Design a protein around this motif. Structure first.
Motif, PDB file in Angstrom:
ATOM      1  N   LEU A   1     -31.566 -17.778 -23.597  1.00 39.93           N
ATOM      2  CA  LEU A   1     -32.075 -16.039 -24.356  1.00 39.93           C
ATOM      3  C   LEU A   1     -31.444 -15.127 -24.969  1.00 39.93           C
ATOM      4  N   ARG A   2     -30.399 -14.896 -25.529  1.00 32.44           N
ATOM      5  CA  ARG A   2     -30.287 -14.451 -26.233  1.00 32.44           C
ATOM      6  C   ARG A   2     -31.048 -14.715 -27.547  1.00 32.44           C
TER       7      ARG A   2
ATOM      8  N   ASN B   1     -34.188 -14.358 -32.167  1.00 33.31           N
ATOM      9  CA  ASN B   1     -34.754 -15.044 -33.074  1.00 33.31           C
ATOM     10  C   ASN B   1     -36.725 -14.518 -32.926  1.00 33.31           C
ATOM     11  N   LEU B   2     -36.497 -14.253 -31.982  1.00 37.33           N
ATOM     12  CA  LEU B   2     -38.320 -13.847 -31.414  1.00 37.33           C
ATOM     13  C   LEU B   2     -38.913 -12.566 -31.870  1.00 37.33           C
ATOM     14  N   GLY B   3     -37.550 -11.403 -32.040  1.00 43.27           N
ATOM     15  CA  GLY B   3     -37.699 -10.614 -32.450  1.00 43.27           C
ATOM     16  C   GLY B   3     -37.329  -9.549 -31.985  1.00 43.27           C
ATOM     17  N   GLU B   4     -36.442 -10.003 -30.655  1.00 46.82           N
ATOM     18  CA  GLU B   4     -35.708  -8.525 -29.877  1.00 46.82           C
ATOM     19  C   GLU B   4     -34.343  -9.412 -29.455  1.00 46.82           C
ATOM     20  N   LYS B   5     -33.223  -8.489 -30.226  1.00 46.25           N
ATOM     21  CA  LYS B   5     -32.590  -8.736 -30.101  1.00 46.25           C
ATOM     22  C   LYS B   5     -32.019  -7.899 -28.061  1.00 46.25           C
TER      23      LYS B   5
ATOM     24  N   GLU C   1     -23.886  -9.100 -22.927  1.00 45.87           N
ATOM     25  CA  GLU C   1     -23.358  -8.332 -21.307  1.00 45.87           C
ATOM     26  C   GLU C   1     -24.805  -8.810 -20.701  1.00 45.87           C
ATOM     27  N   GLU C   2     -26.320  -8.254 -20.522  1.00 42.03           N
ATOM     28  CA  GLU C   2     -27.081  -8.019 -19.822  1.00 42.03           C
ATOM     29  C   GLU C   2     -27.496  -9.711 -19.377  1.00 42.03           C
ATOM     30  N   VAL C   3     -27.856  -9.889 -19.933  1.00 39.82           N
ATOM     31  CA  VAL C   3     -28.101 -11.681 -21.080  1.00 39.82           C
ATOM     32  C   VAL C   3     -27.339 -12.540 -19.713  1.00 39.82           C
ATOM     33  N   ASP C   4     -26.352 -12.533 -20.309  1.00 42.69           N
ATOM     34  CA  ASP C   4     -24.939 -13.802 -19.333  1.00 42.69           C
ATOM     35  C   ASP C   4     -24.880 -12.901 -17.854  1.00 42.69           C
ATOM     36  N   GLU C   5     -25.395 -12.182 -17.652  1.00 47.33           N
ATOM     37  CA  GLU C   5     -25.006 -11.187 -15.964  1.00 47.33           C
ATOM     38  C   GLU C   5     -26.839 -11.382 -15.619  1.00 47.33           C
ATOM     39  N   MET C   6     -28.137 -11.523 -16.330  1.00 45.96           N
ATOM     40  CA  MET C   6     -29.002 -12.168 -16.085  1.00 45.96           C
ATOM     41  C   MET C   6     -29.129 -13.258 -15.217  1.00 45.96           C
TER      42      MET C   6
END
Ligand SMILES: [Ca+2]
Ligand SMILES: [Ca+2]
Length: 71
Positions: free
Chosen positions: A28-29, A34-38, A42-47
């Motif tokens: 996801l990160r 890569n898509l253009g949004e970093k 901490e949120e991803v892992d938690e997501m």
């Protein structure tokens, strides 16, 4: 089934970079970045952690869907 749930099945399928057949937090990160949004690791892992039913850092399409919407 095939009304529209298909696009979801696709988008998520193609998402799995390592085409492992599932979705990990690291993808996801990297993909989002890569898509253009970093996003935030901490949120991803938690997501996923919250959207994980098996608790194996891997979630299918649905387990994710119910999340995609929720922020
Ligand atoms: Ca994965
Ligand atoms: Ca899971």
């Amino acid at each position: 089934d095939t009304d529209s749930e298909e696009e979801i099945r696709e988008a998520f399928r193609v998402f799995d970079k390592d085409g492992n057949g599932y979705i990990s937090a690291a993808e996801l990160r990297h993909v989002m970045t890569n898509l253009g949004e970093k996003l935030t690791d901490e949120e991803v892992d938690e997501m996923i952690r919250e959207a994980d039913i098996d608790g194996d850092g891997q979630v299918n399409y649905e387990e994710f869907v119910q999340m995609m919407t929720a922020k």
